[PDB]
Amino acid sequence: HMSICTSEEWQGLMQFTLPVRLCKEIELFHFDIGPFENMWPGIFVYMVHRSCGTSCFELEKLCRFIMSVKKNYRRVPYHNWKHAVTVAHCMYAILQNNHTLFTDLERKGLLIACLCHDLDHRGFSNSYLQKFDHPLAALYSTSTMEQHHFSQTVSILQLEGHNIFSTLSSSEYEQVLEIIRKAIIATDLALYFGNRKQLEEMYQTGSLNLNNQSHRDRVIGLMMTACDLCSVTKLWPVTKLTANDIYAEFWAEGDEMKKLGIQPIPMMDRDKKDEVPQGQLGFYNAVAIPCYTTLTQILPPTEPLLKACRDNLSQWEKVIRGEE
C-alpha cells in the first residue's frame, strides 16, 4: 500500500551536496525552504547529520527512507511534501538552539516525526472524516488523521532496507517509536489547547520538571505544534503565500461538504473569502500567539518565533484596516 522510491531516486540523494551558502541560512528560524525545491531531501539529510551525526543512520537506509516518505505525500495544496520539510526545518532550528536539553534518541525521533507527521494526508480534516463516517474515523476514533500518519510512518520503516532505527537496542527502539507516536499525535490541534493550558500552569507555578517524563512529553508536544504552525513565523510575504495554499485546501473540502448538503464553516467556504483576514486574526489570537508565548517561556532561545508571529499578527491587522 506504500509507494517506494526508485534506486535512481535514493542514489541521487546520497550524492547530493548542499551549496555552501545555504549552510549558514538553514540554521536560522526564519529560513524559507521555498526557493530550493530540488534540494529539499538533501536539506533534510543535512539537518539530520548536523543534529544527530553523520553516522547516526546508515546513509543508504536514510536516503531510501526519505525518498519513500516524499513519495507517500500526496499532491494536495497544503499538507504535502513541502509542508513536511518546512516543519522538520523548524524542529531542527529549535533543537539546535536547545540541543542538550534533548537526548540523542529524542532528536532523531523528532526530526523523523516531523518529516512524517502528515504522511498520506488527503486534504481532508478530522471534522470531515468523522462527520461523514470515513473508514478511518471508525478505526481511529479521535485524532483520526494523526493516528493514520503514524501508521504510515511505521509502514515505511517496515519496507525492505528502510528501517533506519534497526541499529538501536531493543529498548531504545521501542522508546523512539513511542517518541514518534506521541509527537505525531500531538500535531492534532484539538489536543494543543489542553496541552498549552497545562504547560502554562506548570510553568507559572514552577512545577514544570524536565526529568518528569509526562512533562517532557508535553513540552515535546508544544514543540510539535510550534513547528506545524511555523508558516506564521516566516517573513510576511512567505506567510501570506502559504496561507493561500492552506485555504485552497480548505475550500476544496468545503466544496465536498456542500455536495453532501452541509454548509461548510466560513473558513472552508470559497464564497466567503472576505472573512479570511478576521479568521486569521482569530487563529493568531487563540492558537498561534499563545503557542509561541508559552514555548518561549519554557525554551527562551525560541523567542524569535514569537517575535515573528507577533509581526505577522500586525500584518493581518493591517489587512483588516485596508492597508494591504
Ligand SMILES: [Mg+2]
Ligand atoms: Mg496534520
Ligand SMILES: [Zn+2]
Ligand atoms: Zn502538519
